[PDB]
Structure 1
Amino acid sequence: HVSFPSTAGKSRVMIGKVEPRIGIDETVPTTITVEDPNEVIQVNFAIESTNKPFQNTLLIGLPNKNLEMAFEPEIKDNGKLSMYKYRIDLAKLDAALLQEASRSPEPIKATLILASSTAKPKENLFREILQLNLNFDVDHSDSSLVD
């Protein structure tokens, strides 16, 4: 079958902006990132289904500092169409991530993995899909997780 991803950001925190901008090698990417405006649940769409899912995960956070949170999707299959839902809560993120994203100006990256065992090599997709640029103020100096 063919899948389609829908990453929905609840965004309890007010300020938020998704600005996908990356240039990488050919890793079986075929979709194009599109952002749909809405009131609260501002969902982003993708048709980036090129391999078969045996593991399907969304890694959010800072990769260069080894701060990764993993998210599991909600599957709904209708024949050929396999829709994936990726609920991302901006208030349920762990404090150790926000307390570091507030200070460091670097954006929080978000990539997804859709690999499988039987899939032939050099086509299992491992690509970056979002660069969230958080531009508000959070708490610090009181309960910092770095300590």
Structure 2
Amino acid sequence: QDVHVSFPSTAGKSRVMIGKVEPRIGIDETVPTTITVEDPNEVIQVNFAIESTNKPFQNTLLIGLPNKNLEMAFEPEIKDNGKLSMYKYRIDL
């Protein structure tokens, strides 16, 4: 994560599951944008996207409504071996 790139795989697990997982791209450029992936596994719907251009010190995921100040930050699960570093966010709805 220091001198190498990384990969983010936000997984949205759900005991009660009802989701559509839409996406849009209209914002100022932060030099990191990639398309998300999908899956059809049992109770794990991984989403793969590589926006790991810049150097991380903080690495957090905010979930909620920003217009009414309802946010929730989640803890990353980083795995760095050798030169390859990866992230893992686990969201439980």
**Structure with the higher fraction of residues in strand conformation:** 1
Q: Do both share a fold (TM > 0.5)?
A: yes
Q: TM-score range by the shorter chain?
A: 0.7 to 0.9
Judged with a 3 Å threshold, the aligned counterparts in structure 2 of structure 1 residues 31 and 80 are, in CA distance, closer, same or farther, namely: farther
The alpha carbon displacement at 1:80 in A equals 2.7
Q: Which runs of no fewer than 5 residues in structure 2 stay unpaired?
A: none
**How far apart are the structure 2 equivalents of 1:79 and 1:36?**
28
Q: TM-score, structure 2 length as denominator?
A: 0.85
Farther-moved stretch of structure 1 (76-85 vs 65-74): 76-85
Identity over aligned pairs, percent: 99
Farther-moved stretch of structure 1 (11-20 vs 42-51): 11-20
**How far apart are the structure 2 equivalents of 1:21 and 1:43?**
18
Contact (CA 8 Å) 1:36, 1:45: kept in 2 or not? no
Q: Match of 1:7, SS?
A: strand
- 1:118-147 CA deviation, whole Å, 9 max, x = no partner? xxxxxxxxxxxxxxxxxxxxxxxxxxxxx9
Q: Which runs of no fewer than 5 residues in structure 1 stay unpaired?
A: 89-146
**How far apart are the structure 2 equivalents of 1:64 and 1:30?**
23
Contact (CA 8 Å) 1:73, 1:86: kept in 2 or not? yes
Name which structure has the greater RCO, CA cutoff 8 Å, separation 6+: 2
**How far apart are the structure 1 equivalents of 2:5 and 2:82?**
9
- Determine whether 1:75 maps to 2:72: no
Mark the structure with the bigger radius of gyration: 1
Which residue is equivalent to 2:18?
15
Give the number of aligned pairs: 89
Q: TM-score, structure 1 length as denominator?
A: 0.56
Contact (CA 8 Å) 1:4, 1:81: kept in 2 or not? no
What's the RMSD between the two structures over aligned residues?
A: 2.7
- Determine whether 1:57 maps to 2:39: no
Q: Match of 1:18, SS?
A: coil
Q: Match of 2:67, SS?
A: coil
